[PDB]
Design an enzyme around this catalytic site. Structure first.
Site, PDB file in Angstrom:
ATOM      1  N   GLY A  55      38.804   0.528 -17.637  1.00  0.00           N
ATOM      2  CA  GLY A  55      37.793   1.286 -18.344  1.00  0.00           C
ATOM      3  C   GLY A  55      36.500   0.520 -18.504  1.00  0.00           C
TER       4      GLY A  55
ATOM      5  N   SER B  82      45.156   3.582 -19.786  1.00  0.00           N
ATOM      6  CA  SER B  82      44.707   4.171 -18.523  1.00  0.00           C
ATOM      7  C   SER B  82      43.358   4.849 -18.652  1.00  0.00           C
ATOM      8  CB  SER B  82      45.709   5.197 -18.042  1.00  0.00           C
ATOM      9  OG  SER B  82      47.027   4.740 -18.209  1.00  0.00           O
TER      10      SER B  82
ATOM     11  N   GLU C 209      40.090  -4.247 -15.891  1.00  0.00           N
ATOM     12  CA  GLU C 209      39.258  -3.898 -14.757  1.00  0.00           C
ATOM     13  C   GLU C 209      38.081  -3.060 -15.276  1.00  0.00           C
TER      14      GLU C 209
ATOM     15  N   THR D 105      34.345  -1.354 -24.152  1.00  0.00           N
ATOM     16  CA  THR D 105      35.639  -1.107 -24.729  1.00  0.00           C
ATOM     17  C   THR D 105      36.505  -2.348 -24.566  1.00  0.00           C
ATOM     18  OG1 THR D 105      35.471   1.243 -24.177  1.00  0.00           O
ATOM     19  CG2 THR D 105      37.625   0.357 -24.683  1.00  0.00           C
TER      20      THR D 105
ATOM     21  N   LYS E 109      49.411   4.248 -23.193  1.00  0.00           N
ATOM     22  CA  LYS E 109      48.476   5.297 -23.636  1.00  0.00           C
ATOM     23  C   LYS E 109      47.765   5.874 -22.424  1.00  0.00           C
ATOM     24  CE  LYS E 109      44.099   5.754 -24.702  1.00  0.00           C
ATOM     25  NZ  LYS E 109      43.749   7.205 -24.913  1.00  0.00           N
TER      26      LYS E 109
ATOM     27  N   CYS F 115      33.159   5.814 -10.048  1.00  0.00           N
ATOM     28  CA  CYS F 115      32.306   4.705 -10.365  1.00  0.00           C
ATOM     29  C   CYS F 115      31.248   4.967 -11.430  1.00  0.00           C
ATOM     30  CB  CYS F 115      31.737   4.088  -9.074  1.00  0.00           C
ATOM     31  SG  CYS F 115      30.871   2.479  -9.313  1.00  0.00           S
TER      32      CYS F 115
END
EC number: 1.2.1.88
Lengths: 502, 506
Positions: B257, B179, B285, B261, B204, B318
């Site tokens: 995120g 998340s 996303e 990553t 997580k 954003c």
């Protein structure tokens, strides 16, 4: 206030009988003679330009490997790069074209295949891929036609104060479609589906399916497919994959074939992840099948189902062989019926003799593989060949249907091999577990049993052992769109503050 | 033969007003006071066992960074591996459970959130994440509730000679859900959706959303979610990713995120591809927004829309700042209205003052980033700060809403990630609007949202074609603000015995 709509009713394509005296049987026969002796020259097609390269290749008839059915060439990096650029130039107009418009192309093509071009297409699959009438008919016709009509249907239904709306966009870039040898339809769908969804495709067809793949290609172009939407670019596999995973404009790979090859393509993309304008979408179909027989099974059904499943198209519909699991109490009965029926099986030239059950295997590399699992087969301590085991390649890549009993439960062919494991009736529950713990990337599976509760149970246990699962019978597009919500307001906005803040 | 399809009818959750005197306003106020001073200890939850580790962490209030709202720990590899094994042990029973049964769990949870637990949930998002009443309400309530109900609906409406049938199976293995900080609902959905589809999840949660993430977790468990279906395992990001991409039992990652990553997780999985029993499904996303204004736009609407979009939740919905594109002919009028309205904007403590428009940014690392960016921006020859630009972190991570004009369409800083209350403005010549639209399309890499403001209907149709790939969500004249988790099995059962191997034609 209110909108018009149009959707799409479609029926499955009928599998024809091809019986003596049938219109389709004579059509096919004339089709086959018009192919005897002849050999087609198949260029790469980028846009509307037919292109030849120094690197020339021949597709031969599998049951008559002296007959070259097609001459074609492999595309070079230069040509693949030109094809990519050409496709991208065409993509925005293609994507913006209303899906009804694009669906209509695939529907015309389906209809062309359904009638007028059915014989040619069946003939080119028989002659170039070694399929019998019934095998060519359920693949190159039935399946392929149905893909075209049903995909068209799903795509059109998809696009079916404050006003919201969704827009189904093609992926930004090109899709690489990479076809397998064993199906004509699969190749058509690998390139056809992403294209339907507003994508441009580089299609690398299988070298052992070139003649028919190209028939499908020409049919689509004759049906209205614009230039540069699908580039027909036969190529060396490593070269092609290396080239397209290196392009910043890759947005997807539509693959069918082995797990190793796929893994490799995947790792390639991952390695070049920083160069892509978009995360590429990787679709890969990659395996196994079994027939699990319970003590209640109907032996006649088991036998015919098992023979058809094991040997049709010379066991080339599945990577490995069919693993048969038979309860001890039924084995004597089944072993006899199998051996009896086996010797009645006719392997030969599928064009001349319609009584042929299956023909030669696809190619030399394939024949080699099968022979090695026949030499170093007739050796293993746990394996007794019960039937077949021979194979001659003087005229074509012919392998006899082979049956094998194993005493070891846990022992990639693509040949007509039936492996049998006899299990004790009392140990059937543990044997089901063995099937589940034995399958890595399982394609199909069947359970044979007249007991309804054994079925319900087998289904739970084998839930992840097969993606297609059959009960008492032989075991034989959203990824390409990206939605954009568009919400629109019709009244003005008011203060930025909210009531509660006052 | 009969067919019986079951259908689930569901409505969108109502966004409450919270006006003086309203039941919900008092409920929230009482909720907030019951949080003042207190600090919750949040363990890792594997199965039904609450687990503590040596590695202890604190979640602080952003607008009062002296207040620790939560004490929690990071899971170690040993604990992650234990959680994985425990989940797998529970998975087959969970997958076999009829979807209606599993949907009911998420529906009870939605209803719990909808009323009785609404205040607690809103309060823990306000206090732990620095969201205002309206921001907490549309996220932690409306959107999370709706995910739960609508997912349940889609899942149930999915499972709705011979006889064919489809079976929607969970993936074989565990899904890792990871998340982000800026949404409570997204965390809930990242773990909730795969779970609903017969999956077991290692969740997580974001360290800066621990208090509320855990509220959601506890609600789901109180709603009937069995143990080991979702493991609540706060952790270090690198450690967690390394650990789960190393498991042969990974079948999916559900991530929200940054692009870097994600790319990294993707490469990790690719590297370990040969060890997995199944090809893992990676959902990620990952960006930018813009407001494009045409000469026909309604200025009042443009101004309030652009303020709300730029600054709500301190621009933290954003990664990149809002880029307003204004036609020269309207700039004088809009510049004035923006500057006027800007100074009327109140930034403060969202719990005490409900008149706060937005509060502090999420954390220190975040504050730092914004302080640097503003500094990079200021100096820069092409940037003039028109408003704001200050920021004080003595009491909380407070940044003033900042407005910037650029003379360079391709201003580099504007591509860098901010996550703060910055509005970048580019004034373009009216005659060159078509070319400016192209500039917006050729400027966005991974676009999240975008809005067009125009009273001309043909400019809108046009902007929509051109900006087709510039935003996944696209708004007209308003502010710009599960199948993956199932693998289908087909099941043909033939009732007539089979016959001979031969065919007719033969």
């Amino acid at each position: 206030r209110w909108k018009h709509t149009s959707s799409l009713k479609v029926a499955n394509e009928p599998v024809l009988a091809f019986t003596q005296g049938s219109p389709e049987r004579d059509a096919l026969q004339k089709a086959l003679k018009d192919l005897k002796g002849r050999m087609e020259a198949i260029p790469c097609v980028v846009g509307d330009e037919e292109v030849w390269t120094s690197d020339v290749q021949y597709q031969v008839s599998p049951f008559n490997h002296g007959h070259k059915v097609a001459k074609f060439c492999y595309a070079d990096k230069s040509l693949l790069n030109k094809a990519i650029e050409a496709a991208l130039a065409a993509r925005k107009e293609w994507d913006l074209k209303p899906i009804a418009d694009r669906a209509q192309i695939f529907l015309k093509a389906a209809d062309m295949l359904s009638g007028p071009r059915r014989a040619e297409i069946l003939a080119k699959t028989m002659v170039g891929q070694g399929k019998t009438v019934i095998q060519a008919e359920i693949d190159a016709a039935a399946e392929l036609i149905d893909f075209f009509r049903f995909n068209a249907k799903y795509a059109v239904e998809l696009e079916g104060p404050s006003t919201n709306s969704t827009v189904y966009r093609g992926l930004e870039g090109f899709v690489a479609a990479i076809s397998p040898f064993n199906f004509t339809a699969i190749g058509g769908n690998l390139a056809g589906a992403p294209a339907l969804m507003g994508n441009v495709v580089l299609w690398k067809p299988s070298d052992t399916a070139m003649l028919a793949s190209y028939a499908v290609y020409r049919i689509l172009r004759e049906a209205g497919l614009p230039p540069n939407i699908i580039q027909f670019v036969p190529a060396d596999g490593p070269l092609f994959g290396d080239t397209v995973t290196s392009s910043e404009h890759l947005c997807g790979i539509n693959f069918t074939g082995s797990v190793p090859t796929f893994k490799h393509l995947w790792k390639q993309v991952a390695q070049n992840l920083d160069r892509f304008h978009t995360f590429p979408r990787l679709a890969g179909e990659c395996g196994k099948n079994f027939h699990f027989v319970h003590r209640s099974a109907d032996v006649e059904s088991v036998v015919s189902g098992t023979l058809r499943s094991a040997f049709e198209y010379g066991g080339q519909k599945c990577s490995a062989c069919l693993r048969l699991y038979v309860p001890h109490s039924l084995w004597p009965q089944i072993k006899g019926r199998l051996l009896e029926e086996h010797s009645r099986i006719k392997v030969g030239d599928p064009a001349e003799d319609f009584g042929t059950f299956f023909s030669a295997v696809i190619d030399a590399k394939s024949f080699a593989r099968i022979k090695k699992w026949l030499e170093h087969a007739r050796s293993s301590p746990s394996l007794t060949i019960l039937a077949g085991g021979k194979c001659d390649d003087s005229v074509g890549y012919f392998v006899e249907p082979c049956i094998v009993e194993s005493k070891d439960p846990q022992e990639e062919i693509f040949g007509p091999v039936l492996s049998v494991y006899v299990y004790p009736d009392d140990k059937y529950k543990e044997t089901l577990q063995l099937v589940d713990s034995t399958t890595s990337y399982g394609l199909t599976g069947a359970v044979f049993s007249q007991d309804k509760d054994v079925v319900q149970e087998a289904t739970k246990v084998l839930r992840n052992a097969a993606g297609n699962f059959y009960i008492n019978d032989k075991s034989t597009i959203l990824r390409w769109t990206s939605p954009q919500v568009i919400k629109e307001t019709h009244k003005p906005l008011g203060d930025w503050s909210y009531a509660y803040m006052q």
